[PDB]
Ligand binder design. Structure first.
Ligand SMILES: Nc1ncnc2c1ncn2[C@H]1C[C@H](O)[C@@H](COP(=O)(O)O)O1
Ligand SMILES: Nc1ncnc2c1ncn2[C@H]1C[C@H](O)[C@@H](COP(=O)(O)O)O1
Ligand SMILES: Nc1ncnc2c1ncn2[C@H]1C[C@H](O)[C@@H](COP(=O)(O)O)O1
Ligand SMILES: Nc1ncnc2c1ncn2[C@H]1C[C@H](O)[C@@H](COP(=O)(O)O)O1
Ligand SMILES: Nc1ncnc2c1ncn2[C@H]1C[C@H](O)[C@@H](COP(=O)(O)O)O1
Ligand SMILES: [Ca+2]
Ligand SMILES: [Ca+2]
Ligand SMILES: [Ca+2]
Ligand SMILES: [Ca+2]
Ligand SMILES: [Ca+2]
Ligand SMILES: [Ca+2]
Ligand SMILES: [Ca+2]
Lengths: 549, 549, 48, 98, 49, 49, 49
DNA sequence: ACACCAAAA
DNA sequence: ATCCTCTATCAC
DNA sequence: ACACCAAAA
DNA sequence: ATCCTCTATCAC
DNA sequence: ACACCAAAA
DNA sequence: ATCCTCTATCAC
DNA sequence: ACACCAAAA
DNA sequence: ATCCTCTATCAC
DNA sequence: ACACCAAAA
DNA sequence: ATCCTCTATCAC
């Protein structure tokens, strides 16, 4: 009944072209996964308190307090661009398309391999013998109804290999439980004590304990078996593949010229601000690009390092990414910093556990904010403001030298319109579930695609308990034959895009590579070494200029 | 022919809702069972005499005298709530339904695993090597016709794991044989000897020796085989899910009020007992709730510690459970004490062989009896009884100080009506066979559901004798290759319930949990530890008030 | 029902000093009674 | 009159003023002093008025839950404001007619 | 709320509303137009004003 | 988790904040539940009285 | 009364029945009154508003 | 007035 | 002879 | 008088 | 316009 | 890909 | 053989 | 073996 | 289950 | 679930 | 492939 493959390797990508320039991209992912016995035979409600760090006065923003539930099951997440497309392709799509959208996903497991190891040769030295058990089995299940909490692997760089010819493994399934942690505020050395840094116990009203076994239909897989998913259909909104620029200052009718340049050097002039036509919502009897009326507000002011806290403890508030601006205000316009590692980039020949990191600066210009120049004038507008007639990014709030209006000012509002972030090539997350909150969020910074209806059930896997001749239930803690396994996973991801139209004149930014240089875009980066090592560097999504008005 | 699973894991529970609020509950049980060679290759008629205890004067109530027949076969009992439903569910059903009833059972065996162990490495130390034999087989049989005696596993807390993710094993099949044991009565030290503490030999008229092999159709199971039950239909009576209260004192027409309270403090009054209308069966010319006529007798007086004895030996008489009453008279109103252990509760991290125990106090109030206040007046009723005109729970019978009329009084009779006990969540037995006595018992305290017709055939299992190259039949006692195995068991239990109706005003008792406390109902109890240990505590069945008249 | 671990339910309690004490939703000797607000959403949800 | 305060049960949505704090610029492991405004530092020269009493965390990524109904005394449905631009809900009641 | 981006500075737009007794114009976004003879003006008004 | 509890008392540990994988929108070269990236903001700060 | 009608897939049709005895007496003002309310008695204090 | 923007307007 | 950056309200 | 209590009254 | 604690002798 | 979450997907 | 916490994209 | 490479293989 | 760098001797 | 135990299940 | 100690819910 065995000795015959149950599936087929294929990690291709097809571009099906249709009329009106629509395109049906098809992602093919095949991967070899390894898996060994889950140490805990059961479910463990474990706790984590880093008093070693929480105790310091300034430290809190380093708080790791929580209590997870460790399941003996392992997750199989493929929700990460890096797993489906090939570097070059992402280039192609981005350099050529105008929009992209998720269509359907199809998963498949096969060619199960189960083996047990017997450490023998005690009569000579210390060897290890490998051989497979046929009767042994693996276990699969899919939380299609999504009873279990969502656990995105990119939420930890623990998704699957971005390199096909190299194997990979699964992240173990773990989920949060209810506690109610609490921590007090302190700075550098201050005085007194940390008044109380408590954790807490399980609350009757919010205790939620699930079990793969009481929630899903588990399927047994021996060597000759094989498993396959249904075919999930994505109900999502497409993502544009173009950055913008125009800011409140460049929206529509540029002022009228009265003076025309003489040579390619000197510039031109407008009409007397006093004696100029237009409209404004300030009382002054003149006009200036600065005070002129615009359609709405592009981008907005966000509060810096707004660590807020609830029964859970403290945490930094998330925030809509945006251009960093000349002001190089990163933490100010939510750029993101990733810390991937060798199955997801890294070089490969990089030494030490030190993970490689990358900060992503959003490309939706005209939406960014430069803290420095941001200022609030007063009342009745005055040509040149007094002193106590304008608060700037110098004046301190609540008696702190470096804390300014910026770090607490929130520009958001009705006329505040912006742009949806972009996806990051390798390392980036693809789709995500929606919060079951009667009132939803205009988007997640976590990922590009958010499912409007139900979402892809998570795929769980676990090896089966291979017992010994000895067994007592009431028995303290007991033996089980060593065992581990492998299997291939095959995924199908279909997308839809359309070709961009060329209308400018002046060519336009394209993602390209460069000769052996010190350039960010240097072929060599996406090339093997003499021993065969390579890295995957994030790439620009939305190389081409859009238009917003 | 092997390397392919033969069944599928599923330990779910479905609530199918139908009109008029009827419900079709469906229990799904899957479990991994382990099994090793039966030490006795044959059937053994063994005897058990605990002279070590029977010899003492006071001791008899500790008698364990009998003679069982040990079969090399093992039973597979699933007759225990704890095996089918999930804690929470039992909550749900009880908090929401009004009645429950057995419908059908379906069993299934599959994914057989047979292995032999070879203790080698005699040239180095002392190791153990594991590997499976394919040709080896297992044996199954079902006593559908029920030729063999019934042997409920809950009759010993030896049913199957109540925890799915943890394996389990089978209780070996053993059954009583005929002897005729005898023991004399003695107390603390007395005088003389125990006149005769005999056992006895097999009697021609009642000797009954069966054999799995001459009674059933045994099916051989190799690795790729699989076995499956028919589909038994329960022919039983439903069990209410509500406790009662009303007692003879509160049945119908409360007396007429003549005095009405003034403030929420003081109470009201009735009419002159002498000059009050009604009926009674006492000669007095007055009336009182105590002596008034009621529809029938609710609950009744049972004899305390009525150790009776027959050719078998002595034993305590069983007795219909009932409320314990303020009198806290447990042994008096048959509460029951269970002694479960780690596959059926226990904590888990509890040390030592010490089993955990739990006493169940029945909730059918108004049916209980408080020995203290129970009394018999005399003849011709007298307002306040003399002395030698009323026997109380003080006066001693047959010259013993503590033995009162209670311990020998039996209140039972025509007008004596009561309520069927309730089921106990984990540890509790579900259904049971009926005594083949031409005159049956109004119920069993052993379990809730008693089959009106034939009942579920017991499922027997045994490994097959794996022989060696050496074998002589006439040979004293001989070798057989070490071997053990496993397999999954899947059960299907369907039930029928209906939703309760809300008609009161005043809310009502519901089974709930409580925050991390010292409360009996404290989430934490049904939660894992840091190492993953958990217990199962019995839960209230019939949280809601009924009505009986 | 999908958890394992039972869950918070609105219940009443014997004659106590408890917020949930039958007596509150009961008449007096002269027949007086009050209506105390009750918990809506006793059971744990999930949002992600 | 008898009174009753209703504390909402949508946990994980609440806020503890005490621990809420804003750090500065370029994040620093343990913040200086003039490098973090807390619920101690006073705004506009008033001792007890802190950033909390004027800070508005709301925004695009700000998602929450619809209140719950209160058994006796509670309102059931309600009309909608005839304002060309409506409110994401009324705290006045649970059900708002579309 | 003059805010600024790579473009430069500019006053934030804001939903118009009643000025209130407080006569807070710039505070509740009233708008000031500066039309001219093809769009109003008197006509006999002198100067570019 | 990198450290597993021994008895129902003591807890477990994670990996070095410095040497831990994940993403954040703060410049620091480490990671903590506090600063980690989340799907969106649950609840928000409201102005008192 | 209040009826709980049970249907499949566990849907339920609850039906609320309310009956009540109402009392009513003559409206003192025979007409419509545009009345005013000013609590100077409280508005006058400094802290009070 | 389809023809609501990314599909099957 | 206007439909969301082409032809092409082409998607009717 | 179905209409017998928990199903197919 | 009575059917076993609802509507609903609804289960006919 | 209906099957958009609470109905009549 | 993935549909919003079951069975059951069961609501087609 | 069409199926010959950029169309109408 | 080989057709000119995809799917697709798809262009038959 | 007939299939109710001794007949006409 | 469970029906009252066989085959045989064989008594349908
Ligand atoms: N969907 C579609 N297919 C084909 N031709 C179309 C379609 N819609 C419009 N038209 C025609 C009608 C006009 O002849 C022309 C306009 O462009 O295209
Ligand atoms: N079984 C059943 N199905 C449907 N309608 C019924 C049934 N029995 C009675 N009725 C009708 C007869 C009356 O119109 C009404 C009485 O309740 O319900
Ligand atoms: N609405 C509805 N009624 C009945 N059966 C359905 C319905 N929708 C799907 N199905 C069937 C189709 C499959 O046989 C099964 C899937 O669950 O149920
Ligand atoms: N010209 C053309 N049109 C459509 N389908 C085709 C054509 N030529 C081959 N085929 C089919 C035949 C097979 O089903 C498949 C092979 O690719 O495509
Ligand atoms: N009453 C009766 N007569 C004959 N055959 C029967 C009867 N009842 C069941 N059977 C058949 C049906 C199966 O073929 C077999 C089962 O035993 O017997
Ligand atoms: Ca479902
Ligand atoms: Ca038979
Ligand atoms: Ca046109
Ligand atoms: Ca009626
Ligand atoms: Ca399904
Ligand atoms: Ca081909
Ligand atoms: Ca048979």
């Amino acid at each position: 009944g065995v000795g015959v493959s149950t599936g087929s390797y294929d990690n291709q990508t097809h571009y099906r072209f249709l009329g009106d320039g629509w395109v049906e991209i098809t992602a093919l992912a095949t991967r070899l996964v390894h898996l060994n016995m889950p140490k805990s035979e059961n479910y463990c409600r474990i706790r984590v308190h880093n008093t070693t760090d929480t105790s310091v006065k300034g430290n809190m923003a380093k708080d790791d307090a929580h209590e997870q539930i460790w399941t003996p099951w392992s997750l199989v997440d493929a929700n990460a661009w890096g797993v489906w497309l090939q570097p070059s392709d992402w280039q192609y799509i981005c350099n050529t398309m105008s929009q992209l959208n998720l269509v359907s996903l199809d998963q498949e497991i096969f060619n199960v391999v189960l083996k047990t190891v017997t450490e023998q040769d005690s009569g000579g030295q210390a060897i290890k013998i490998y051989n497979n058990d046929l009767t042994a089995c693996m276990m699969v299940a899919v939380d299609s109804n999504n009873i279990l909490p969502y656990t995105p692997a990119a939420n930890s760089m623990e998704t699957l290999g971005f390199y096909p010819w190299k194997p990979t493994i699964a992240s173990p399934y773990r989920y949060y439980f209810c506690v109610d942690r609490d921590l007090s505020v302190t700075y550098e050395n201050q005085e007194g004590t940390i008044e109380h840094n408590v954790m807490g116990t399980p609350k009757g009203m919010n205790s939620q304990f699930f079990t793969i076994e009481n929630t899903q239909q588990i399927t047994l897989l021996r060597t000759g078996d094989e498993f396959a998913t249904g075919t999930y259909y994505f109900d999502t909104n497409p993502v544009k593949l173009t950055h913008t620029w125009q800011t409140n200052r460049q929206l529509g009718q540029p002022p009228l010229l009265s003076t025309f340049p003489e040579a390619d050097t000197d510039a031109g002039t407008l009409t007397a601000q006093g004696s100029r036509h237009g409209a404004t919502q300030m009382e002054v009897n003149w006009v200036s690009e600065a005070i002129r009326t615009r359609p709405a507000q592009v981008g907005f002011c966000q509060p810096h390092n707004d660590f807020e806290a609830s029964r859970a403890g403290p945490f930094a508030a998330p925030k809509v990414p945006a251009d960093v601006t000349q002001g190089m205000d990163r933490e100010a316009n939510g750029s993101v910093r990733y810390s991937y590692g060798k199955q997801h980039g890294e070089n490969w020949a990089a030494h030490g556990p030190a993970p490689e990191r990358y900060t992503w600066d959003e490309t939706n210009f005209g939406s960014g904010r430069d803290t420095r120049d941001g200022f609030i004038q007063s009342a009745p507008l005055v040509v040149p403001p007094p002193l106590n007639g304008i608060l700037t990014n110098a004046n301190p709030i609540g008696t702190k030298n470096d804390i300014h209006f910026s770090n607490v000012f929130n520009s958001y509002g009705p006329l505040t319109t912006f742009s949806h972030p972009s996806p990051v090539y390798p390392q980036g997350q693809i789709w995500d579930k929606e919060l079951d909150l009667e009132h939803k969020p205009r988007l997640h910074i976590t990922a590009p695609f958010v499912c409007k209806n139900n979402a892809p059930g998570q795929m769980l896997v676990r090896l089966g308990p291979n017992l010994t001749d000895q067994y007592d239930p009431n028995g303290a803690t007991l033996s089980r034959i060593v065992t581990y396994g492998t299997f291939f996973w095959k995924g199908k991801l279909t997308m839809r895009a359309k070709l961009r139209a060329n209308t400018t004149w002046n060519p336009v930014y394209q993602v390209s590579v460069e000769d052996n240089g010190n350039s960010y875009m240097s072929v060599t980066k996406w090339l093997p070494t003499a021993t065969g090592n390579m890295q995957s560097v994030p790439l620009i999504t939305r190389p081409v200029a859009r238009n917003t008005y």
